[PDB]
Symmetry: D2
C-alpha cells in the first residue's frame, strides 16, 4: 500500500507505473482497468518486459484478481471508463495510459464510476498540465485532474529552468532522436493522424513532430513561444535523447553551463537531470533510475551567444517514475 491508485492501460507505460508505484513509492494498493488483457495476461505482461528485464517477487493469479507481491490488485474489464467502476478498491487517485483519453471532458469523465483526482500520461490541449521539474506550488487542491507532460516535453523542462534561469535564452529550437513507440509500425502500412508516415520500424530514420515548446512553455511560462520542435524516431526500442540549441542573453562558457547544471542538479532537482561528465554512454540509461539526463561532452560547442546542448531520456520508465513522483506530490498536497 501507500496513496490509493488504479490504472488505465496495462501497457508499457502502465506496467512501470503499476510496477514502480509499488517498489519506488509503493503507495497503497490499487486495481487494473484493462479491457483487452485478461486475468492472466496481466500476470505475464506486467512481469515480463523485453525492454526492462522480468518482474521478480511473484506476480500471480489468485482471487478475483492479481496478487502482485500479495498486495491485492484487481482486473476491471470495461471499455469506456465511466463504464467501468473504480469506486471499488477506493482508488481515489488513478493514472491512465490508453491513447484516446486525454482532456478534462474525458479523464474528467471517470469519476462517474468512482475516481477523485486522475493523473494522465501525456499532454492535453484542454486541462491542467505539469511535470515534476517546474510543478511547484502550481498544483492546487482546487484541482481535480492533472497531466504529466510527454516523454519529450518532461525531460526538456528540467534543462529549461537551470539554463534559462541563469543565462538568458532568447530563441532556441530542438530535435529528439527517440526510441520507438507504441505507434511506429512493422514493415509498411497506413498510419493515421500526423501520418508519422507509419512506414518503418526497423528500416528507416523517421522524421516527426512533437510540441516541445507548447509543453515546455506551459511548464516554464517565460519560455512558451521562444521554443518549438520536431523529432526523428529511430528504430531504438527503449531510450532517447534531446538536442537543444540556444542563443543566449548572458555569455556562456561551455565549462560554465555544465557546472551550473552540476551545482544546480546537485541541490534542488536531484530527481530529474544528472550531469555525467561520464563519456559517451550512448544509450545505456534504460531505466537508469533518473528522468532527464544531461551530460557535459556530447555535442557541445560554444561561442558567447549561440551554444548547443544535449540532455536525455529513458522515456518509458524515467517517465513512469515522475508520475509516481507527482502522484505523491498531488496526494500529500491535496
Amino acid at each position: 500500500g501507500k496513496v490509493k491508485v488504479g490504472v488505465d492501460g496495462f501497457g508499457r507505460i502502465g506496467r512501470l507505473v503499476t510496477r514502480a508505484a509499488f517498489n519506488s513509492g509503493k503507495v497503497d494498493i490499487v486495481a487494473i482497468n484493462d479491457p483487452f488483457i485478461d486475468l492472466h495476461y496481466m500476470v505475464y505482461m506486467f512481469q515480463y518486459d523485453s525492454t526492462h528485464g522480468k518482474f521478480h517477487g511473484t506476480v500471480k493469479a489468485e482471487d478475483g484478481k492479481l496478487v502482485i507481491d500479495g498486495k491485492a490488485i484487481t482486473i476491471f474489464q470495461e471499455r469506456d471508463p465511466e463504464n467501468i467502476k473504480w469506486g471499488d478498491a477506493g482508488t481515489a487517485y488513478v493514472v491512465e495510459s490508453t491513447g484516446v483519453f486525454t482532456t478534462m471532458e474525458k479523464a474528467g469523465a471517470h469519476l462517474k464510476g468512482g475516481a477523485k483526482r486522475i493523473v494522465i500520461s501525456a499532454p492535453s490541449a484542454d486541462a491542467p498540465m505539469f511535470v515534476m521539474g517546474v510543478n511547484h506550488f502550481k498544483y492546487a487542491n482546487s484541482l481535480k485532474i492533472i497531466s504529466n507532460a510527454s516523454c519529450t516535453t518532461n525531460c526538456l523542462a528540467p534543462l529549461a529552468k537551470v539554463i534559462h534561469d541563469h543565462f538568458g535564452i532568447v530563441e532556441g529550437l530542438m530535435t529528439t532522436v527517440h526510441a520507438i513507440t507504441a505507434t511506429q509500425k512493422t514493415v509498411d502500412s497506413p498510419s493515421g493522424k500526423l501520418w508519422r508516415g507509419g512506414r518503418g520500424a526497423a528500416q528507416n530514420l523517421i522524421p516527426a513532430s512533437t510540441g516541445a515548446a507548447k509543453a515546455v512553455g506551459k511548464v516554464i511560462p517565460e519560455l512558451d513561444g521562444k521554443l518549438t520542435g520536431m523529432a526523428f524516431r529511430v528504430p531504438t526500442a527503449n531510450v532517447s535523447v534531446l538536442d537543444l540549441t540556444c542563443r543566449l542573453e548572458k555569455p556562456a562558457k561551455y565549462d560554465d553551463i555544465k557546472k551550473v547544471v552540476k551545482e544546480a542538479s546537485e541541490g534542488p532537482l536531484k530527481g530529474i537531470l544528472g550531469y555525467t561528465e561520464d563519456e559517451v554512454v550512448s544509450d545505456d540509461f534504460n531505466g537508469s533510475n533518473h528522468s532527464s539526463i544531461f551530460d557535459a561532452g556530447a555535442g557541445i560547442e560554444l561561442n558567447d551567444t549561440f551554444v548547443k546542448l544535449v540532455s536525455w531520456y529513458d522515456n518509458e520508465f524515467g517517465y513512469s517514475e515522475r508520475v509516481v513522483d507527482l502522484m505523491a506530490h498531488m496526494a500529500s498536497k491535496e
Copy 2:
C-alpha cells in the same frame, strides 16, 4: 489489361498482386477494394514499399480511381465484401489478401457482392487449396473459388514433389526461419490467437506454429502425414528459409540428392524451385523473381536414409508471383 482482376487488401501482399499482376501478367484492367486506404494512399502506399523499393512509370489518381500505368484502376473502400460493388469493372477474378477472409463461406460471399471466381492469398479450413508447384489437373471449372498455399506452405510443396517421387521419404519434420509478418509487433503487448507472443519484434527470435503438415499433404496427397512443422520468426522483414529433414526409402548421396532437383528443376518446374550451387547467399532473394529456392551446400549432411535438406522463400513476393501464376492458369481453364 490481361485477365481481368480485383483485389482484397491493398497491403503488403496486396500491392504485389496488383504490382505484378500488371508487370508479370498484367491481366488486364482491374479495381481496388480497400476500407482504410483512401483514394490517394493507394498511389503512395502501393507505389512505396520500404521492402522492395518504390514503384516507377507512374502511379497517379485522376477521375474516380487511380491510373496504374494509365490502366484505369478503381478504389472501393467497403467494409465487408458483400457490401462492395465488384461487377463494376467486370472483374470475375478478384484475389483476397485480408486476414480473416478464409473459407468458402465468405470468399463465396464477394460473389454475391458481384464476383465470379476469387483466389485467396492464404490457406483455408474448408475450400479448394492449391499451389502452382503441385497444382496440375487438380484445378477444374467445378471451381468457382480457390486458394494458393501459405507463404511457407507454397515453398515446401515444390521441394517435396522433386524429393518424394524420386527418393522415398518416410517421416520428415520442418522449421522455418521466417521473416516478419503483418502480425509481428513492436515493444511487447496483448496479442491473440495461436498466441505468437506479440512479444518482441527487433529484440527476440520468436518461437512459432505452422501447418506445413496438412498443407503440403493436400498439395501432394501421398506426403500428408509423413510431415508437420513449426517456425521461428525473426526481425528479418522480407524473405525466409525452410528446413526439412527426412528419412528416405531409396538411398541418397548428397551429391545425388542435390543432383535430382538440378535436372528436375531445369525441366517441369522452372518458375518454382531454383538450385544454387552458388554459395549461401544469406537472404538477398527479396524479389529475386523465384518461388521457392533451394541450393546445394547450405546445411546439407548425408547418410543412406537420413538427411536434412534446405530450401528458401522470397515469401511476400515470390508468393505474390505464384498468385498471378495461378490467376494465369485459373482463367485459362474455366
Copy 3:
C-alpha cells in the same frame, strides 16, 4: 578470492568469466592478460555491457591494476602469452578467450610465463575437451589443460544424456538459430576462414556451420557419429536456441520426453537444462542463470520413432558460468 585465476581476452566471454568467477564462485583473486585494452579500458568495458546491464560494486583504477570490488586484479599487456608472465599473482589455473589460441601446442604454451592448468573457451582439434554436463570422472589430474565445448556444443550435450540414455536415438540432425557473434560483420565485406559469408549483421538470416556432433560425441561417446550440424546466425546479439530432431530406439510420447528431462533435470543436472512448461518465452533468458534450457511446447511433434525437440542457450553467459563451474571441478579435483 577462491581458486586462483588469470584470463586471456578481456572481452565478452572474458568479462563474464572475469565477472562471474568473482560473484558466482569468486574463487580467489586473479590478473588480466589484455593486449589491446588498457589499464582504464578494463574498468569501463568489463563494468558496462549492452547485452547484460552495467557492473555495480565499483570497478576502479588504482595501483598498477584494477580493483574490482577491491580484490586486487592486474593488467598484463603482452601479445604472445609465453611472452607475458602469469607467474605473478600466482595464477595457477587461467582461462583464455582470444580467437587464435586453442590446441595443446599453444594453450599448452602459456606455462612458460607461469600458468599450471589452463581452461579454454572453445573447442580444439588437438586436446582434452569437456563440458559441465557429461565431464564426470573424465577430468584427470593427469591432465594439464582442458577446454569447454562451444556455445552450441555445450548446450547440445545436456539434451543428449537424458534423451539418448533413455529412449534410443539412432540418427539425429540439428540447426541452431543463434545470436551474433564477435565475427559477424557491419554492412558488407570480406570475411575469412569458413567465409561465414561475412556479409550481414543486421540485414540477413546467415546460414552457417558448426560441429555439433564431433563435440557432442567427444562429450557423450555413444552419440559421436550419429549427430552433425549447421546453424544460421541471425541478427539477435545475445541468446540462441537449438533444434534437435531424432529417430529413436524406445518409443516416445511427447508427454514422456518432457517429464524424463523434468524428473532428470530435477536431480543430477540441476545446473544445465531447465524445462519450462512455461510458453514461448522467445528469447528472454540472456543470462537467465541457467546453461542449456529446454522446454516442453515449442516445436514438438511426436510419432513412435521420429520426434522433434528444442533446448536453448543464452551463449555468452550460461557459457561463462559452466566454465567457472568446471574451474572448481578441475581445481578441487586436481
Copy 4:
C-alpha cells in the same frame, strides 16, 4: 572506358566508385588495388551488396584480372600503394578509399607507385579539398592531387551556398542522424581514436564527432567559423539526414526559404540539392541518384532571424556519385 581510372579500397565506398564510374561516366578502362580481396572476391564482393542490391550484366574473372562488363579490369593486391604498380593500365586518375591514406604526403606516394592525379574518398588534414557542390574554378592544374569532402561534409556544402548567399546566416550549428559506418561494431569492444564507443551497433543511438565546421568552411570560405557540429550514429546501414540551425541576416519566411533552394535547385546545382515538398520520405533515398537532398516540410519552423532547416544523404552512394562527378570535371581541366 572513359577517363582512365584505378582505385583504393575495393569496399563499400570502393565498389560504387568502380560500379558508377562505369554506369554513370564509365570513364574508361581501369584497375583494382586491394590487399585482402583476391581476384575472385572482387567479382562477388563488388557484385553483391546487401545494401544496394546485387550488380548485373556480368562480373567475371578471365585472364589475370576481372571482366567488368568486358572492360578488362585488373587486380593488384599490394599493401602499401608505393609498392603497387599502377602505370599498369595507364591510370593517371586513381581514387583512394582506404581509411588511413589521407594527406598529400601519402596520396602523393602512389604517384611514385606509378600514378598522376588521385581523388580521395574522405577529408584530409593538409591537401586540397573540394566537393562538387561549391567546387567551381577552385580546381586548377597546379593540381596533381585532390579530395571530395566527407559523406556528410559534401552534403552540407550544397545547402549552404543556396542559404548563405541568399539570406545572411550568422551562427549555425548541426547534427547528423547518420547511417552505419565501416568503423561501427557488433557486440561491445575496444575501439580507438576519437573513441566512438565501438560500443553498440544494433542496440544504441551512438553520440559522435564530425567536422562540418572546418569542412564546409573550406568549401565555402565565407562560412568557415559561423559553423561546427556533431552527429549520432544509429543502426541505419545506408543513408543519413542532416540538421542545420541558423540565424540569418535578411529575414526569411519558411515559405521563402524553402522557395530559394527550389528556384536555385532547378538551375545551377541539379545533381546536388533536391527539394521534395513530396513528404518526409523517411530514409528511402539509398541509391536515389542524388547528392544531398532537402525538402520542405520536415522539421522546419520559422522566425525572422532564427530557423532550423534539414537536408539528407544517400551517403555511401550519393558520395560515390560525386567522386565520379569530380573525376569527371578533374580530368577535363588538367
